[PDB]
């Protein structure tokens, strides 16, 4: 309140009225002793009820503008994370076996369900039981999707390496059974 431009009048009117109490004041000067700090006090309160509103308004943009900054800084951290993805899932397209089906296409459009089926290098087979295993993945090589795949690893549900000799007809009760066979393309 030490810089409000209505402190001078209030201060002076207080001094004139209050400080001059000991001195004999007649009933005519008493009006000046009374109706001089009055009105001035009203105006000061008016000069303080507007300052309090300007302060709050001000401290509602120095908070709503930190939030406009925060979000743009964030908008630049996700815009650079999707970019770092769509350029890492691209360096992975064996562009000899992929430009060989987009080319044999009538216009260059192909179904998406035949891209991993004809242009992939690895196969993952998930097998529930032993009966399913001998009709799908018997031996070290097997044919699927008009191709030939050679087994490379057989992990299990626990993710521990199984060998192709632990898989018997009677040792089967001793394996975590969802078995995951990883195979590579041949030729």
């Amino acid at each position: 309140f030490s810089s409000l431009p209505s402190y001078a009048a209030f201060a002076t009117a207080q001094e004139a009225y209050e400080q001059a109490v000991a001195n004999g004041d007649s009933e005519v000067v008493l009006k000046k002793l009374k109706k001089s700090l009055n009105v001035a006090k009203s105006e000061f309160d008016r000069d303080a009820a507007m300052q309090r509103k300007l302060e709050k308004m001000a401290d509602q943009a120095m908070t709503q503008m930190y939030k406009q900054a925060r979000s743009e800084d964030k908008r630049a951290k996700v815009t650079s994370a999707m970019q770092t993805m769509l350029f890492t899932m691209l360096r992975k397209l064996d562009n000899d076996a992929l430009n060989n089906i987009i080319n044999n296409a009538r216009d260059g459009c192909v179904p998406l369900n035949i891209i991993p089926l004809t242009t992939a290098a690895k196969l993952m087979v998930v097998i529930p039981d032993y009966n399913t295993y001998k009709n799908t993945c018997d031996g070290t090589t097997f044919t699927y999707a008009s191709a030939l795949w050679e087994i490379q690893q057989v992990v299990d549900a626990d993710s521990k390496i199984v060998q192709l000799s632990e898989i018997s007809m009677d040792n089967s009760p001793n394996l975590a059974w969802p078995l995951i066979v990883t195979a590579l393309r041949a030729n």
């Binding site: 300007l54 308004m57 001000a58 503008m65 900054a69």
Partner: protein, 586 residues
């Protein structure tokens, strides 16, 4: 929108507009640079302007706050608030405020329209951050002055070495010479298609580059101005004298390529930075080759600034150096591809400032510092920051192509920070052993500025010829001509068998092109031809004004030839301070 006040570095959120590049002036510091200049606009997280119906009132200094938008006096809501007041513009982080007594330079740097030498004098007496800001804004104003050119529309072509080109209406013809490489980009239907690196000859038309494009219909020739990136890393670091040799391994034997290089290792390996102050043709091209081989256990790099000057660094490289052991970089601008490309792991890297890989090193060389602006040093330090580096070059050479200053000449010291810091505290070295050069240049540069500290080595056989022909200059159009030059050259080769296998120097490429159209001479650059000087050369008058030949242009041009130096007087040039032979013209 929150960063370092160009000046105080504290975090701000503001940023002027006057400043084309738009730096992050802090809070307080805006009160100086905002009121103390035409610079008024301001942009913080949100832009400042009377959001009131299509208004047009700005100068924040006058604009007031209120509500949640801003309003100057335009229509300030009852609950307004001066946006501008107590030395501070309302902006994020207000207590970290500080500002600094630095609006001094800051204000001259901001206000400097870059027309007189005083712009460069005041730009060169400031602090590190002010220096960076001044270099950035200088490059900005120069490129945005340079892009003020139209397009060249081409629809047909007759044959090779011929083309009918015409600039737009109201736009003058872009300058003749090749200092502004014509990297054009035509259009096919929607985007920019490649053209190639080009350069003009005259308004016959010989293409001195190495490329071939199928030009025809719809071709658009343009001048490409790259969007400059903001500079971050400093251009230098204060040094400190140590005692312990860390990492460096002196060789068990002596690579006695040179004799004085032992003092070079004794004087250079101690301090954190130095400079090879070598006179022209006194070992300014292959001392770094010796330092490369005397310290094989230290990572050593070389950067350059021009594609032309790669002759000396390549000939001895094939003569006595391997291919695989070195490394080169070229993107897909154009240069030799003899060596290994794309090899971040090597001991002898050659590279140019156009593009470098982010890596650190311990010893670098930086050829032609005198051609390079402070921005070039700062960018080559930011892209590749290494422990020690040496700036190949000498201040006593030609100025950089600063076409922004015309009336006033450019003194050496104000070329860059190094070309004065090395004058004040003293040069770090001085050489006087010219490998392959007569002592004429030795005497000349000893009398001029060396004060006769290095003396004549080879006998002055008085084989240099100088005459008293002045010539007459005349200007007609944007390109200039010299009538007493088509005949003067013929009058000088009338009966001299020795220079029938000589080259031609081209201070002004226009006159050289005209004379080659009349008679026919190979074109040779003046600026980017240091170290490529032929044995037998002729110096032509070629000019009569103060535009190029005032003091510091002939020092490297009178030492091109080895045995026969015929350098005719062209102006009041030192004529009555020494003696000179003279063949009497018929």
């Amino acid at each position: 929108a929150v960063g370092a006040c160009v000046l105080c570095n504290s975090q701000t959120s503001l940023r002027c507009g006057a400043c084309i590049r738009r730096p992050f002036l802090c809070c307080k510091c805006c009160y100086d640079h905002v009121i103390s200049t035409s610079h008024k606009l301001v942009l913080s997280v949100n832009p400042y302007v009377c959001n009131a119906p299509g208004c047009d009132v700005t100068d924040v200094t006058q604009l007031y706050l209120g509500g949640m938008s801003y309003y100057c006096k335009s229509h300030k809501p009852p609950i307004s608030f001066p946006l501008c007041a107590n030395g501070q513009v309302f902006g994020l982080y207000k207590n970290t405020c500080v500002g600094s007594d630095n609006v001094t330079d800051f204000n001259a740097i901001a206000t400097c329209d870059w027309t007189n030498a005083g712009d460069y004098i005041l730009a060169n007496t400031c602090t590190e951050r002010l220096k960076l800001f001044a270099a950035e804004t200088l490059k900005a104003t120069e490129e945005t002055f340079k892009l003020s050119y139209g397009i060249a529309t081409v629809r047909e072509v007759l044959s090779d070495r011929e083309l009918h080109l015409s600039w737009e209406v109201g736009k003058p013809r872009p300058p003749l010479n090749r200092n502004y490489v014509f990297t054009g980009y035509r259009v096919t239907k929607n985007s920019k298609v490649q053209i190639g690196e080009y350069t003009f000859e005259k308004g016959a038309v010989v293409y001195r580059g190495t490329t071939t494009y199928k030009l025809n219909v719809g071709d658009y020739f343009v001048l490409t101005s790259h969007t400059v990136m903001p500079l971050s890393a400093p251009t230098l670091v204060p040094q400190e004298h140590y005692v312990r040799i860390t990492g460096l391994y002196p060789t068990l034997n002596i690579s006695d390529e040179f004799s004085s290089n032992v003092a070079n290792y004794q004087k250079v390996g101690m301090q954190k930075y130095s400079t090879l102050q070598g006179p022209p043709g006194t070992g300014k091209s292959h001392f770094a080759i010796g330092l490369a081989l005397y310290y094989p256990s230290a990572r050593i790099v070389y950067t350059a600034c021009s594609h032309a000057a790669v002759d000396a660094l390549c000939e001895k490289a094939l003569k006595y150096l391997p291919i695989d052991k070195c490394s080169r970089i070229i993107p897909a601008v154009e240069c030799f591809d003899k060596f290994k490309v794309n090899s971040t792991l090597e001991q002898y890297v050659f590279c140019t400032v156009n593009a470098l890989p982010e890596t650190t090193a311990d010893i670098v060389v930086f050829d032609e510092i005198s051609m390079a602006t402070n921005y070039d040093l700062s960018v080559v330090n930011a892209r590749l920051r290494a422990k020690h580096y040496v700036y190949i070059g000498d201040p006593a050479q030609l100025p950089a192509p600063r076409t922004l200053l015309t009336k006033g000449t450019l003194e050496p010291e104000y070329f860059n920070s190094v070309c004065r810091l090395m004058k004040t505290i003293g040069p770090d070295m001085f050489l006087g052993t010219c490998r392959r050069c007569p002592a004429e240049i030795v005497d000349t540069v000893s009398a001029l500025v060396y004060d006769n500290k290095l003396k004549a080595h080879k006998d002055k056989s008085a084989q240099c010829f100088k005459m008293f022909y002045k010539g007459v200059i005349t200007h007609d159009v944007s390109s200039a001509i010299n009538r007493p030059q088509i005949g003067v050259v013929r009058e000088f080769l009338t009966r001299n068998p020795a220079w029938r296998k000589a080259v031609f120097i081209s201070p002004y490429n226009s006159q050289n092109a005209v004379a080659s159209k009349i008679l026919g001479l190979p074109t040779q650059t003046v600026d980017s031809s240091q170290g490529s000087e032929y044995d037998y050369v002729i110096f032509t008058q070629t000019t009569e004004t103060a535009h190029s030949c005032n003091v510091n242009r002939f020092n490297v041009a009178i030492t091109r030839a080895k045995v026969g130096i015929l350098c005719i007087m062209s102006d009041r040039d030192l004529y009555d301070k020494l003696q000179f032979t003279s063949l009497e013209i018929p």
